[PDB]
Amino acid sequence: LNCIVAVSQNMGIGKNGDLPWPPLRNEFRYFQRMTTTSSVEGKQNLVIMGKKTWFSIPEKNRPLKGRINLVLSRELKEPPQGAHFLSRSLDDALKLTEQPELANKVDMVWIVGGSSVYKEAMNHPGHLKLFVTRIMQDFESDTFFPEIDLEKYKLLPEYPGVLSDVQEEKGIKYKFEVYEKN
Amino acid sequence: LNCIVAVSQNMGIGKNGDLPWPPLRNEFRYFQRMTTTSSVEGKQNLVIMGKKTWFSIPEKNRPLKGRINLVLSRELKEPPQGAHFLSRSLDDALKLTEQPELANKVDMVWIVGGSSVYKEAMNHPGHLKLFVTRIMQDFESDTFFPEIDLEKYKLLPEYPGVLSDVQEEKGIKYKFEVYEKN
Ligand SMILES: Nc1nc(=O)c2cc(CNc3ccc(C(=O)N[C@@H](CCC(=O)O)C(=O)O)cc3)cnc2[nH]1
Ligand SMILES: Nc1nc(=O)c2cc(CNc3ccc(C(=O)N[C@@H](CCC(=O)O)C(=O)O)cc3)cnc2[nH]1
Structure with missing residues (x-):
């Protein structure tokens, strides 16, 4: 179980149901590269996200x-269009990926948001990895990311795939960090 | 929804976790064809059975x-070796069925028993068909097939792929029937 998020200096992850920052195409490309790249031959990654984060992807x-x-939601009676599966819980969704028909087709599981999902997932007993993008500037948010407990999480000073130096896009600097727990 | 069973004259479907009769090679040929045959290319049929059934199948x-x-199991921890999926009630299995990625891989649903399942499936709302092979002889049994509500089910005088003639094998006579409900 991998969590993937981009957060501002203020820990905000959202505003009005959108990234509180203007589009970083490279930051996007990387998120697109991590959640896609599967380690195993012929296996695919599964992304999980709440109702809101699904509607927040450019419809196209x-x-x-x-x-x-x-997509997790306790409300929706059926998978919103284009969705592959629907679960009411993070557990139920974790179970399902445990069905062997499934298990033999999925490699990595990535949690993409929103807040309460990241919350439920961060707590979950088990080996968890947090991929966080530090967007080094404040932005006006309505939704935030939780405190990464240092009792539990440790920052991997290294990570195959991830660059260590500070990035910049449209006068915005950011850096990719990797935390782990067991 | 398709249910497929064989019943002795006394409505028996099992003796000590086995069929009450000796094996009718040509009746197992029928259950096989019917259950395996899909309308669509690249789609497969799904078989749901209780735990006892699962196990009454010769392990090879x-x-x-x-x-x-x-596999339908209220208690079973995880899915028995070789089963594809595990659910706890006909309900989840069916729901499981409407999952978009699932739904496009699956054509027909067949309920292969046991008593408790047949029954839940029989009552269940919708368009249901029972495929009943009537073994024209009494056999001592411990498991009995729920009795069919004539008020709801209706014998179809013919139905594509179903031989109309009384059959006999090992001196035993059987007949293929199909019931429908709306
Ligand atoms: N690093 C990181 N960056 C994000 O932008 C991000 C966004 C979410 C949640 N929201 C979204 C919203 C839209 C898209 C999205 O459009 N993804 C496309 C974009 C890739 C591209 O178009 O260049 C994808 O194909 O991955 C993804 C996540 C969660 N973790 C993240 N993590
Ligand atoms: N018509 C009918 N006949 C049955 O024998 C039957 C059996 C069950 C439950 N029990 C069983 C037990 C064994 C096998 C079985 O070995 N099937 C194999 C091989 C058939 C053959 O040997 O020709 C298969 O490939 O289906 C199937 C169901 C439920 N509905 C039925 N319904």
Whole structure:
């Protein structure tokens, strides 16, 4: 279980149901590269996300491509269009990926948001990895990311695929960090 | 929804976790064809059966080849070796069925028993068909097939792919029947 997020200096992850920052095409490309790249031959990654984060993808790249898109919601009676699966819980969704028909087709599981999903997932006993993009500037948010507990999480000073130096796009600097827990 | 069973004259379907009769090679040929045959190319049929059924299949005929095997178990921890999916009630299995990625891989649904399942499936709202092979002889049994509500089910005088003649094998006579409900 991998969590993938981009957060501002203020820990905001959202505003009005959108990234509180203007589009970083490279930041996007990387998110697109991590959640897609599967380690195993012929296996696919599964992304999980709440109702809101699904509606927040530009309608034209829904469902994420080359990925199994699952959506959690206790409300929705059926998978919103383009969605691959639907679960009411993070557990139920974790179970399902445990069905062997499934298990033999999925490699990595990535949690893409929103807030309460990241919350439920961060707590979940088990081996968890947090891929966080530090967007080094404040932005006006309505939704935030939780405190990464240092009792539990450790920052990997290294990570195959991820560059260590500070990035910049449209006068915005950011850096990719990787935390782990067990 | 398709249910497929064989019943002795006394409505028996099992004796000590086995069929009450000796094996009718040509009746197992029928159940096989019917359950394995899909209308669509690149789609497969799904078989749902209780745990006892699962186990009454000769362990080298497990799981049923060319079919997605699904196990109904309230307690079973994880899915028995070789089963494709595990659910806890007909309900989840069916729901499981309407999952978009699932739904495009699966053509027909067949309920292969046991008593408790047949029954739940029989009552269930919708368009249901029972495929009944009437074994024209009494056999001591411990498991009995729910009795068919004539008020709801209706015998179809013919139905494509169903031989109309009384059959006999090993001196035993049987007949193929199909019931429908709306
Ligand atoms: N690093 C990181 N960046 C994000 O932008 C991000 C966004 C979410 C949640 N929201 C979204 C919203 C839209 C798209 C999206 O359009 N993804 C496309 C974009 C790739 C591209 O178009 O260049 C994808 O194909 O992955 C993804 C996540 C979660 N974790 C993230 N994590
Ligand atoms: N018509 C009918 N006949 C049955 O024998 C039957 C059996 C069950 C449950 N039990 C069983 C037990 C064994 C096998 C089985 O070995 N099937 C194999 C091989 C058939 C053959 O040997 O020709 C398969 O490939 O289906 C199937 C169902 C439920 N509905 C039925 N319905």
